[PDB]
Amino acid sequence: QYLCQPLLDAVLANIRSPVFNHSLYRTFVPAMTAIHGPPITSIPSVLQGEVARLDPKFLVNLDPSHCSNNGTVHLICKLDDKDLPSVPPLELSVPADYPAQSPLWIDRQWQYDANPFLQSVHRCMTSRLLQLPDKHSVTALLNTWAQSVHQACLSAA
Amino acid sequence: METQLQSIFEEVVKTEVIEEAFPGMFMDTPEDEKTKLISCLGAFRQFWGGLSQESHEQCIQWIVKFIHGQHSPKRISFLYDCLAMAVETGLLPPRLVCESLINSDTLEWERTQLWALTFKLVRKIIGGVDYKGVRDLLKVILEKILTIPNTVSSAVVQQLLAAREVIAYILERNACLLPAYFAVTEIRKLYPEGKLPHWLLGNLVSDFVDTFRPTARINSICGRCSLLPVVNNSGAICNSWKLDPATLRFPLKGLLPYDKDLFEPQTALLRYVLEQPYSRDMVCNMLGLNKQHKQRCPVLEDQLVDLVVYAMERSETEEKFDDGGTSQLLWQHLSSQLIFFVLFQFASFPHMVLSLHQKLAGRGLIKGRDHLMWVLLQFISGSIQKNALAD
């Protein structure tokens, strides 16, 4: 910073030299070692952390069909609630690298037929899921699937 | 225009930010699959009303790049259902919107859900495409298929298999959207004979070319390769006998699957022509050269070597059944026209020197040696000052 440019200029002059480690040795070694003293004497862990704090009211497990040990995964959900009636079990679709991507869900229109209650459930699904934000976790979709059953049961009752 | 539709698409595709916080409390459903689409198509059609003919397409070029700008694939499917009925109303033709999806770079071989949705949609809107549009789309689909490498991970293979059945439906001649005569031309342009196509094409195209097998049989001429003309000096060269000077084949009409014998070099025709005397005018005709233009054809120097080494064995086998062996006349012929070939300098001398050095290395057949330097002397004596000693 002030009066150190001989030390700075010596190393740039002595750089790209093969005798560098020996030139510095020859010019420097006896000065410090004399006075100052002598020398001394399967599944990724993302889903494993995801399912850890999932609700016990879901019993989601893997799909028995489709491919396995690959990038894309599918989880079929089980709902055991005494409050809510029976519905189709629903199945998701999550590709590889589950963080920072937006997954999908299967489509089967005829499974929710023979009852306008199931059609209202499907319409509520198309209402709630279309405004869900990007890159969200599976808890948001699971809970929006869970609340719509009560939201349709109150209209049915 | 662009800004008003910017605002409209912004308020249509938005997943609201304050939504999903303190959630599930409103007693109000959003606009469903019909009402939201009606609301968006109203603004779309009033924007289209003040849209000129040239500005119809370019906003479409933005629309897809906004749709490809989206990231929720359920929202993408909702937009696909929007555009499925938007082109049904006649506001957008299903001829100009098909290539708008593919033209975006976002449709690569990694957005496989987008790939499946796009190919299903263009399968659905295929009805409003003429023969010219079908021909335009098949080639870009083919090169897009060619962009995929040979081996890609099989997690998304069935997402990519849809194009195979799409092309198979397109290739169906019973529907007859486009004649197969135009369909085979692009495939043959990309994949000629002896050229392997991409592995994604499947057996169907290999069958599709096979149905053109009788057609070339219509154009097949029996024993055409064995037919030869006569060498004359009368002019008016017959164009049927003419070949391709660059690679020694007959010219062909179209890209039909011709037989194998039409694809080899016909060295025999020029062999018979040059073996006979007075092969002066039609040798330029069959090679297409006007003889005043400096071309310096390298392969043309090959057969001139190949005759000369052949001239070795006619001077090597016996040369004793006759006093001249019917060779010194042919030696005079070789001395006459070979120096006329280098008179226009279409055959560079040290290349023949090195080629003869390579050819004679290995055989060692030295019997007719006396001719070999003598005609070489005919090169040295007559061309003493026109060149240096490097040759």
Next chain:
Amino acid sequence: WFCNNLIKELLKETRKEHTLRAVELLYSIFCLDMQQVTLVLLGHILPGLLTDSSKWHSLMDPPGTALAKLAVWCALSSYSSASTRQKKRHREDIEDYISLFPLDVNMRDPLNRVLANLFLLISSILGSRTAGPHTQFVQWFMEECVDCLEQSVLQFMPFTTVSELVKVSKVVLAITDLSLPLGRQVAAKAIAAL
């Protein structure tokens, strides 16, 4: 040496009829010593057709299908089972087939050995991910195994490969079940996954 000369020359074709004539001629040429080409095609040639990655780029729609038909013509005929010189040259030679192929009806007959070994290679191709022309070749493999079969030539099917065909996506699933009494329940399980 002779098979190696002709196999590389098989890779010049793009016309299906043009290669199929050569394959039909090679069927009789291999039928001259069918008892040996049924064991050397499946022995070192087919492993040599799949070991590297780029080598199946030749295995395409004309030549792969033609070679698959060529193999299935010879295989059945060897299951069914032409010169004095062939009797002469087959006398002196002895060979350790277990040293060549340790296997990872009889299981000592090379007809029962090498043919059963090939199904392990087909399982290795199909179970391997990153699908390419090799998957096309193994899907062309057994699609003609039932075409000539009016109604065991496929007795040596391993049990794990039954579920694989529906994993890569009909009636050939029921054909591969062999209609065994023990195969009855796994046949029902396989057709349940449809």
